[PDB]
Protein backbone atom coordinates (compact mmCIF):
# COMPACT_ATOMS: atom_id res chain seq x y z
CA UNK A 1 0.00 0.00 0.00
CA UNK A 2 1.24 3.47 -0.99
CA UNK A 3 -0.25 6.96 -0.81
CA UNK A 4 -0.85 8.62 -4.18
CA UNK A 5 0.57 12.10 -4.81
CA UNK A 6 0.94 14.26 -7.92
CA UNK A 7 4.44 14.00 -9.35
CA UNK A 8 4.96 17.77 -9.42
CA UNK A 9 3.23 21.11 -8.89
CA UNK A 10 4.30 24.60 -9.93
CA UNK A 11 3.25 28.18 -9.29
CA UNK A 12 4.37 31.76 -9.67
CA UNK A 13 6.09 33.62 -6.84
CA UNK A 14 3.89 34.86 -4.01
CA UNK A 15 1.00 32.57 -4.96
CA UNK A 16 -0.68 29.44 -3.60
CA UNK A 17 -0.03 25.77 -4.35
CA UNK A 18 -1.87 22.63 -3.25
CA UNK A 19 -0.75 18.99 -3.05
CA UNK A 20 -3.07 16.03 -2.49
CA UNK A 21 -2.43 12.72 -0.72
CA UNK A 22 -5.06 10.07 -1.52
CA UNK A 23 -5.06 6.90 0.57
CA UNK A 24 -7.74 4.61 2.03
CA UNK A 25 -9.60 3.99 5.28
CA UNK A 26 -6.74 1.81 6.52
CA UNK A 27 -4.27 4.72 6.52
CA UNK A 28 -5.35 8.28 5.71
CA UNK A 29 -8.98 7.71 6.68
CA UNK A 30 -8.08 6.17 10.04
CA UNK A 31 -6.82 9.45 11.50
CA UNK A 32 -4.51 12.40 10.84
CA UNK A 33 -1.72 12.67 8.25
CA UNK A 34 1.79 14.13 8.48
CA UNK A 35 3.83 16.23 6.05
CA UNK A 36 7.56 16.70 5.52
CA UNK A 37 9.74 18.85 3.25
CA UNK A 38 12.99 17.67 1.63
CA UNK A 39 15.35 20.23 0.09
CA UNK A 40 18.49 18.68 -1.47
CA UNK A 41 21.45 19.05 0.86
CA UNK A 42 19.15 19.89 3.78
CA UNK A 43 17.72 17.51 6.35
CA UNK A 44 13.96 16.98 6.02
CA UNK A 45 11.83 19.29 8.13
CA UNK A 46 8.43 18.28 9.48
CA UNK A 47 5.77 20.57 8.01
CA UNK A 48 2.44 19.47 9.54
CA UNK A 49 1.34 16.80 12.00
CA UNK A 50 -2.27 15.97 12.56
CA UNK A 51 -4.80 17.21 10.05
CA UNK A 52 -3.90 20.87 10.49
CA UNK A 53 -1.42 21.45 13.36
CA UNK A 54 1.22 23.81 11.97
CA UNK A 55 4.83 22.74 12.47
CA UNK A 56 6.96 23.86 15.40
CA UNK A 57 8.71 26.45 13.22
CA UNK A 58 6.72 26.68 9.98
CA UNK A 59 5.12 30.05 9.13
CA UNK A 60 1.44 30.75 8.46
CA UNK A 61 1.82 30.39 4.69
CA UNK A 62 1.72 26.61 5.08
CA UNK A 63 -1.72 25.14 5.73
CA UNK A 64 -3.23 21.68 6.06
CA UNK A 65 -6.64 20.15 5.34
CA UNK A 66 -8.36 16.79 4.94
CA UNK A 67 -11.68 15.57 3.55
CA UNK A 68 -12.43 11.85 3.63
CA UNK A 69 -9.60 9.64 2.39
CA UNK A 70 -7.46 12.38 0.78
CA UNK A 71 -5.39 15.03 2.56
CA UNK A 72 -4.15 18.28 1.03
CA UNK A 73 -1.24 20.55 1.96
CA UNK A 74 -1.32 24.23 1.02
CA UNK A 75 1.53 26.73 0.57
CA UNK A 76 0.56 30.40 0.34
CA UNK A 77 2.75 33.39 -0.58
CA UNK A 78 5.27 31.31 -2.52
CA UNK A 79 8.99 31.97 -2.14
CA UNK A 80 11.99 30.93 -4.20
CA UNK A 81 13.48 28.94 -1.30
CA UNK A 82 10.44 26.63 -1.26
CA UNK A 83 11.47 24.50 -4.25
CA UNK A 84 11.52 21.07 -2.62
CA UNK A 85 10.04 17.58 -2.48
CA UNK A 86 7.05 17.19 -0.14
CA UNK A 87 6.04 13.84 1.36
CA UNK A 88 2.80 12.90 3.10
CA UNK A 89 2.74 10.15 5.71
CA UNK A 90 0.42 8.27 8.06
CA UNK A 91 0.11 4.94 9.86
CA UNK A 92 -1.71 1.73 8.97
CA UNK A 93 -2.51 -1.33 11.14
CA UNK A 94 0.06 -0.19 13.74
CA UNK A 95 1.13 2.99 15.49
CA UNK A 96 4.82 2.20 14.84
CA UNK A 97 4.24 1.23 11.19
CA UNK A 98 4.38 4.13 8.74
CA UNK A 99 3.57 4.59 5.05
CA UNK A 100 4.66 7.49 2.86
CA UNK A 101 3.32 9.20 -0.22
CA UNK A 102 4.98 8.83 -3.61
CA UNK A 103 6.28 12.40 -3.33
CA UNK A 104 5.68 15.75 -5.01
CA UNK A 105 8.28 18.21 -6.30
CA UNK A 106 7.36 21.91 -6.18
CA UNK A 107 8.87 24.58 -8.43
CA UNK A 108 8.27 28.33 -8.13
CA UNK A 109 8.22 30.17 -11.47
CA UNK A 110 8.62 33.81 -12.45
CA UNK A 111 12.15 34.42 -11.18
CA UNK A 112 14.23 37.02 -13.07
CA UNK A 113 16.10 35.53 -16.01
CA UNK A 114 19.87 35.50 -15.53
CA UNK A 115 22.70 34.82 -17.99
CA UNK A 116 25.30 32.18 -17.09
CA UNK A 117 28.83 32.94 -15.98
CA UNK A 118 31.40 30.63 -17.58
CA UNK A 119 34.90 29.78 -16.34
CA UNK A 120 37.08 27.35 -18.30
CA UNK A 121 40.05 25.91 -16.39
CA UNK A 122 43.06 24.29 -18.09
CA UNK A 123 44.63 21.04 -16.86
CA UNK A 124 46.74 21.27 -13.73
CA UNK A 125 50.49 20.68 -13.80
CA UNK A 126 50.08 17.70 -11.46
CA UNK A 127 47.45 16.08 -13.69
CA UNK A 128 49.72 16.63 -16.70
CA UNK A 129 52.48 15.03 -14.61
CA UNK A 130 50.58 11.85 -15.28
CA UNK A 131 49.39 11.83 -18.88
CA UNK A 132 45.78 12.93 -18.54
CA UNK A 133 44.32 16.36 -19.31
CA UNK A 134 40.89 17.39 -18.03
CA UNK A 135 39.38 20.70 -19.12
CA UNK A 136 36.72 21.92 -16.68
CA UNK A 137 33.94 24.29 -17.79
CA UNK A 138 31.99 25.70 -14.84
CA UNK A 139 28.60 27.30 -15.58
CA UNK A 140 26.89 29.28 -12.83
CA UNK A 141 24.31 31.92 -11.91
CA UNK A 142 21.79 31.35 -14.71
CA UNK A 143 17.99 31.22 -14.75
CA UNK A 144 16.07 29.36 -16.06
CA UNK A 145 18.07 26.16 -15.50
CA UNK A 146 18.52 24.61 -18.96
CA UNK A 147 21.78 25.20 -20.83
CA UNK A 148 23.27 23.41 -23.83
CA UNK A 149 27.02 22.91 -24.17
CA UNK A 150 29.20 22.16 -27.19
CA UNK A 151 33.00 21.97 -27.26
CA UNK A 152 35.15 23.25 -30.13
CA UNK A 153 38.78 22.60 -31.06
CA UNK A 154 40.43 24.55 -33.90
CA UNK A 155 37.09 25.62 -35.34
CA UNK A 156 35.58 22.12 -35.18
CA UNK A 157 32.96 20.62 -32.89
CA UNK A 158 34.30 17.97 -30.50
CA UNK A 159 32.12 14.85 -30.42
CA UNK A 160 34.01 12.40 -28.19
CA UNK A 161 35.00 12.48 -24.50
CA UNK A 162 32.48 15.07 -23.25
CA UNK A 163 30.42 14.75 -20.06
CA UNK A 164 27.99 17.37 -18.73
CA UNK A 165 26.07 17.37 -15.45
CA UNK A 166 22.43 18.36 -15.13
CA UNK A 167 21.78 21.81 -13.69
CA UNK A 168 21.28 22.15 -9.93
CA UNK A 169 20.10 25.03 -7.76
CA UNK A 170 22.54 27.17 -5.77
CA UNK A 171 22.23 28.85 -2.38
CA UNK A 172 21.09 32.07 -4.10
CA UNK A 173 18.42 30.11 -6.04
CA UNK A 174 20.15 30.41 -9.41
CA UNK A 175 21.28 27.38 -11.37
CA UNK A 176 24.73 25.96 -12.06
CA UNK A 177 26.23 23.16 -14.13
CA UNK A 178 29.60 21.77 -15.19
CA UNK A 179 31.02 20.10 -18.30
CA UNK A 180 34.16 17.98 -18.62
CA UNK A 181 36.54 17.25 -21.49
CA UNK A 182 38.84 14.31 -20.72
CA UNK A 183 41.94 14.00 -22.92
CA UNK A 184 45.51 12.80 -22.61
CA UNK A 185 48.41 15.19 -22.27
CA UNK A 186 49.53 14.51 -25.87
CA UNK A 187 46.06 15.53 -27.08
CA UNK A 188 46.03 18.68 -24.92
CA UNK A 189 49.22 19.94 -26.57
CA UNK A 190 48.08 18.60 -29.96
CA UNK A 191 45.57 21.35 -30.78
CA UNK A 192 45.90 25.12 -30.74
CA UNK A 193 42.74 26.24 -28.95
CA UNK A 194 39.85 24.75 -26.97
CA UNK A 195 36.51 26.49 -26.43
CA UNK A 196 33.52 25.86 -24.16
CA UNK A 197 30.29 27.09 -25.77
CA UNK A 198 27.36 27.48 -23.35
CA UNK A 199 23.94 28.29 -24.82
CA UNK A 200 21.12 29.60 -22.64
CA UNK A 201 17.82 31.05 -23.92
CA UNK A 202 19.14 31.74 -27.40
CA UNK A 203 22.31 33.44 -26.13
CA UNK A 204 25.81 31.96 -26.09
CA UNK A 205 28.86 32.56 -23.88
CA UNK A 206 32.24 31.26 -25.05
CA UNK A 207 35.50 30.86 -23.13
CA UNK A 208 38.80 29.81 -24.70
CA UNK A 209 42.08 28.37 -23.43
CA UNK A 210 45.23 28.00 -25.55
CA UNK A 211 47.73 25.29 -24.50
CA UNK A 212 50.65 27.42 -25.73
CA UNK A 213 49.72 30.47 -23.62
CA UNK A 214 48.99 28.60 -20.37
Amino acid sequence: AVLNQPSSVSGSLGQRVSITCSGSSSNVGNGYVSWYQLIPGSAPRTLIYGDTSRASGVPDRFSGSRSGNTATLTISSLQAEDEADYFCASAEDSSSNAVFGSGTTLTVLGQPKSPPSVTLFPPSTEELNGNKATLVCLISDFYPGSVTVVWKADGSTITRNVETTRASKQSNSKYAASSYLSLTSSDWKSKGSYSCEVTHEGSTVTKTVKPSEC
Binding site: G31, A43, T46, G50, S96, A98, E127, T165, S168
Partner: protein, 247 residues
Protein backbone atom coordinates in the same frame (compact mmCIF):
# COMPACT_ATOMS: atom_id res chain seq x y z
CA UNK B 1 20.70 14.53 15.28
CA UNK B 2 23.73 12.70 13.88
CA UNK B 3 24.08 9.33 12.15
CA UNK B 4 27.40 7.52 11.82
CA UNK B 5 28.58 4.34 10.15
CA UNK B 6 30.21 2.92 7.02
CA UNK B 7 29.49 4.41 3.61
CA UNK B 8 30.08 1.21 1.61
CA UNK B 9 29.32 -2.45 2.31
CA UNK B 10 29.56 -5.43 -0.02
CA UNK B 11 26.45 -7.31 -1.18
CA UNK B 12 25.08 -9.98 1.18
CA UNK B 13 26.55 -8.42 4.34
CA UNK B 14 25.07 -6.52 7.30
CA UNK B 15 24.93 -2.71 7.49
CA UNK B 16 25.10 -1.03 10.91
CA UNK B 17 24.83 2.68 11.74
CA UNK B 18 24.36 4.67 14.94
CA UNK B 19 22.55 7.84 15.99
CA UNK B 20 23.89 10.49 18.37
CA UNK B 21 19.60 12.29 25.49
CA UNK B 22 17.40 9.24 26.10
CA UNK B 23 14.25 11.33 26.69
CA UNK B 24 12.92 10.85 23.16
CA UNK B 25 11.86 8.23 20.61
CA UNK B 26 14.20 7.76 17.64
CA UNK B 27 13.37 6.07 14.35
CA UNK B 28 15.25 5.19 11.17
CA UNK B 29 13.91 6.32 7.78
CA UNK B 30 15.68 5.43 4.54
CA UNK B 31 15.31 6.69 0.98
CA UNK B 32 16.83 5.10 -2.10
CA UNK B 33 18.12 7.50 -4.79
CA UNK B 34 15.11 9.07 -6.47
CA UNK B 35 12.64 6.76 -4.71
CA UNK B 36 10.22 7.70 -1.93
CA UNK B 37 10.69 7.57 1.84
CA UNK B 38 10.56 4.06 3.30
CA UNK B 39 9.82 3.32 6.94
CA UNK B 40 12.23 0.96 8.71
CA UNK B 41 11.93 0.90 12.51
CA UNK B 42 11.20 2.88 15.65
CA UNK B 43 12.38 2.80 19.26
CA UNK B 44 10.47 4.28 22.20
CA UNK B 45 11.78 5.11 25.68
CA UNK B 46 10.64 1.83 27.26
CA UNK B 47 12.68 -0.35 24.89
CA UNK B 48 9.89 -1.44 22.54
CA UNK B 49 10.51 -1.15 18.81
CA UNK B 50 8.09 -1.12 15.87
CA UNK B 51 9.15 -2.25 12.41
CA UNK B 52 8.02 -2.34 8.82
CA UNK B 53 6.39 -5.79 8.46
CA UNK B 54 7.96 -6.39 5.05
CA UNK B 55 11.44 -5.31 6.16
CA UNK B 56 11.14 -6.96 9.59
CA UNK B 57 13.09 -10.25 9.31
CA UNK B 58 16.20 -8.50 7.99
CA UNK B 59 16.15 -5.52 10.38
CA UNK B 60 17.01 -4.83 14.02
CA UNK B 61 17.67 -1.86 16.30
CA UNK B 62 19.61 -2.07 19.58
CA UNK B 63 21.79 0.38 21.54
CA UNK B 64 22.16 1.94 24.98
CA UNK B 65 20.47 4.03 18.88
CA UNK B 66 22.03 1.64 16.35
CA UNK B 67 20.29 -0.16 13.48
CA UNK B 68 21.30 -3.21 11.45
CA UNK B 69 20.03 -4.64 8.15
CA UNK B 70 20.77 -8.20 7.03
CA UNK B 71 21.93 -9.73 3.72
CA UNK B 72 22.01 -6.32 2.03
CA UNK B 73 21.68 -6.14 -1.76
CA UNK B 74 21.95 -3.39 -4.36
CA UNK B 75 18.34 -2.47 -3.53
CA UNK B 76 19.53 -1.46 -0.04
CA UNK B 77 21.70 1.43 -1.29
CA UNK B 78 19.94 4.44 0.22
CA UNK B 79 20.27 7.54 2.38
CA UNK B 80 19.53 6.39 5.93
CA UNK B 81 18.04 8.99 8.29
CA UNK B 82 17.77 9.08 12.08
CA UNK B 83 14.52 10.80 13.02
CA UNK B 84 12.85 11.83 16.27
CA UNK B 85 9.55 9.93 16.23
CA UNK B 86 6.36 10.51 18.26
CA UNK B 87 4.05 7.49 18.01
CA UNK B 88 0.75 7.07 19.85
CA UNK B 89 -1.97 4.41 20.01
CA UNK B 90 -5.38 5.42 21.38
CA UNK B 91 -8.06 2.87 22.26
CA UNK B 92 -11.60 4.22 22.02
CA UNK B 93 -15.00 2.74 22.72
CA UNK B 94 -16.50 1.68 19.35
CA UNK B 95 -18.86 4.58 18.83
CA UNK B 96 -22.52 3.95 19.40
CA UNK B 97 -21.65 2.71 22.87
CA UNK B 98 -21.87 6.32 24.00
CA UNK B 99 -20.64 5.69 27.56
CA UNK B 100 -17.12 4.45 28.30
CA UNK B 101 -17.34 2.40 31.49
CA UNK B 102 -14.43 2.35 33.91
CA UNK B 103 -11.21 0.37 33.84
CA UNK B 104 -12.47 -2.08 36.48
CA UNK B 105 -15.13 -3.40 34.10
CA UNK B 106 -13.17 -2.70 30.88
CA UNK B 107 -16.34 -2.42 28.80
CA UNK B 108 -18.34 0.05 26.72
CA UNK B 109 -22.10 0.47 27.06
CA UNK B 110 -24.95 2.08 25.16
CA UNK B 111 -26.68 3.00 28.45
CA UNK B 112 -24.93 4.08 31.63
CA UNK B 113 -27.04 1.84 33.88
CA UNK B 114 -25.11 -1.17 32.52
CA UNK B 115 -21.61 0.05 33.43
CA UNK B 116 -21.52 -1.52 36.90
CA UNK B 117 -21.91 -4.95 35.31
CA UNK B 118 -19.15 -7.40 34.48
CA UNK B 119 -19.21 -9.06 31.07
CA UNK B 120 -22.53 -10.86 30.56
CA UNK B 121 -23.67 -10.25 34.14
CA UNK B 122 -27.15 -9.26 32.90
CA UNK B 123 -29.17 -11.15 30.30
CA UNK B 124 -29.69 -7.92 28.33
CA UNK B 125 -26.00 -6.94 28.55
CA UNK B 126 -25.26 -8.20 25.03
CA UNK B 127 -27.52 -5.69 23.25
CA UNK B 128 -26.25 -2.50 24.90
CA UNK B 129 -22.62 -3.25 25.79
CA UNK B 130 -19.42 -4.68 24.35
CA UNK B 131 -15.84 -5.30 25.45
CA UNK B 132 -14.13 -4.53 22.13
CA UNK B 133 -12.45 -1.24 21.26
CA UNK B 134 -11.58 0.94 18.26
CA UNK B 135 -7.80 1.12 17.76
CA UNK B 136 -6.69 4.36 16.08
CA UNK B 137 -3.01 5.14 15.47
CA UNK B 138 -1.33 8.55 15.27
CA UNK B 139 2.25 9.13 14.16
CA UNK B 140 4.73 11.70 12.86
CA UNK B 141 8.43 12.64 13.08
CA UNK B 142 9.42 15.35 15.55
CA UNK B 143 12.94 15.98 14.22
CA UNK B 144 15.29 14.74 11.51
CA UNK B 145 18.94 14.01 10.93
CA UNK B 146 20.98 15.14 7.94
CA UNK B 147 21.25 11.57 6.63
CA UNK B 148 24.17 9.25 5.83
CA UNK B 149 24.26 7.76 2.33
CA UNK B 150 25.32 4.09 2.35
CA UNK B 151 26.25 2.46 -0.97
CA UNK B 152 26.04 -1.30 -1.54
CA UNK B 153 28.46 -2.48 -4.21
CA UNK B 154 31.05 -5.10 -5.04
CA UNK B 155 33.42 -2.28 -6.05
CA UNK B 156 36.45 -1.20 -4.03
CA UNK B 157 36.77 2.17 -2.29
CA UNK B 158 38.93 4.31 -4.60
CA UNK B 159 40.09 7.61 -3.14
CA UNK B 160 40.19 10.80 -5.24
CA UNK B 161 43.20 12.72 -6.50
CA UNK B 162 42.53 16.44 -6.05
CA UNK B 163 43.96 18.98 -8.50
CA UNK B 164 43.94 22.79 -8.25
CA UNK B 165 42.04 24.90 -10.78
CA UNK B 166 43.52 28.25 -11.83
CA UNK B 167 43.00 30.34 -14.95
CA UNK B 168 45.59 30.86 -17.66
CA UNK B 169 47.39 34.15 -17.03
CA UNK B 170 45.60 35.72 -20.01
CA UNK B 171 41.27 39.75 -13.95
CA UNK B 172 38.56 41.76 -12.17
CA UNK B 173 37.04 38.95 -10.06
CA UNK B 174 39.32 35.97 -9.45
CA UNK B 175 37.90 32.44 -9.66
CA UNK B 176 39.60 29.31 -8.33
CA UNK B 177 38.54 25.70 -8.09
CA UNK B 178 39.44 22.20 -6.95
CA UNK B 179 39.01 19.17 -9.21
CA UNK B 180 38.22 16.05 -7.18
CA UNK B 181 38.67 13.33 -9.82
CA UNK B 182 38.23 9.55 -9.98
CA UNK B 183 36.73 8.46 -6.67
CA UNK B 184 34.19 5.85 -5.61
CA UNK B 185 31.72 5.86 -4.09
CA UNK B 186 29.79 8.99 -3.14
CA UNK B 187 29.83 11.36 -1.34
CA UNK B 188 32.61 13.91 -0.78
CA UNK B 189 32.54 17.19 1.15
CA UNK B 190 34.48 20.27 0.02
CA UNK B 191 35.01 23.37 2.15
CA UNK B 192 37.34 26.34 1.69
CA UNK B 193 39.86 27.48 4.32
CA UNK B 194 38.28 24.94 6.70
CA UNK B 195 34.94 26.71 6.23
CA UNK B 196 36.07 30.26 7.02
CA UNK B 197 35.24 31.10 3.38
CA UNK B 198 31.50 30.55 2.96
CA UNK B 199 30.58 33.27 0.43
CA UNK B 200 30.99 32.66 -3.28
CA UNK B 201 31.37 28.87 -3.04
CA UNK B 202 29.57 26.24 -5.10
CA UNK B 203 30.33 22.51 -5.09
CA UNK B 204 28.96 21.02 -8.29
CA UNK B 205 27.20 17.66 -8.57
CA UNK B 206 29.34 14.70 -9.54
CA UNK B 207 29.97 13.33 -13.03
CA UNK B 208 30.54 9.71 -14.07
CA UNK B 209 32.86 8.80 -16.94
CA UNK B 210 32.96 5.45 -18.74
CA UNK B 211 35.40 4.09 -16.13
CA UNK B 212 32.61 4.20 -13.54
CA UNK B 213 34.59 6.69 -11.44
CA UNK B 214 33.16 9.94 -10.09
CA UNK B 215 34.58 13.42 -10.56
CA UNK B 216 33.34 16.76 -9.26
CA UNK B 217 34.64 20.29 -8.86
CA UNK B 218 34.18 23.04 -6.28
CA UNK B 219 34.60 26.69 -7.23
CA UNK B 220 35.34 29.78 -5.15
CA UNK B 221 35.06 33.41 -6.25
CA UNK B 222 37.12 36.15 -4.60
CA UNK B 223 38.49 39.71 -5.23
CA UNK B 224 46.00 32.17 0.06
CA UNK B 225 43.19 29.66 -0.51
CA UNK B 226 43.08 25.97 0.41
CA UNK B 227 40.19 23.64 -0.42
CA UNK B 228 39.45 20.77 1.98
CA UNK B 229 38.21 17.55 0.37
CA UNK B 230 37.06 14.58 2.45
CA UNK B 231 35.96 11.12 1.27
CA UNK B 232 34.48 9.00 4.09
CA UNK B 233 34.55 5.73 2.12
CA UNK B 234 38.37 5.88 1.95
CA UNK B 235 39.03 7.74 5.25
CA UNK B 236 40.72 10.39 3.10
CA UNK B 237 41.09 14.05 4.09
CA UNK B 238 43.13 16.19 1.67
CA UNK B 239 43.87 19.91 2.13
CA UNK B 240 45.32 21.01 -1.22
CA UNK B 241 46.42 24.62 -1.65
CA UNK B 242 45.42 26.60 -4.74
CA UNK B 243 48.30 28.95 -5.56
CA UNK B 244 47.68 31.28 -8.52
CA UNK B 245 49.85 31.28 -11.62
CA UNK B 246 52.84 33.62 -11.79
CA UNK B 247 53.29 34.45 -15.49
Amino acid sequence: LRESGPSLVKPSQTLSLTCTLSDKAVGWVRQAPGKALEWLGSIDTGGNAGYNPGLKSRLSITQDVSLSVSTVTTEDSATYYCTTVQQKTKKSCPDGYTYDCGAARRTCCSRYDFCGYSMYARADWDWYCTANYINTYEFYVDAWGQGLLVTVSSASTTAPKVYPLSSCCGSSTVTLGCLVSSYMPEPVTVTWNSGALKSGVHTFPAVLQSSGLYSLSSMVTVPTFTCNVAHPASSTKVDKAVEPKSC
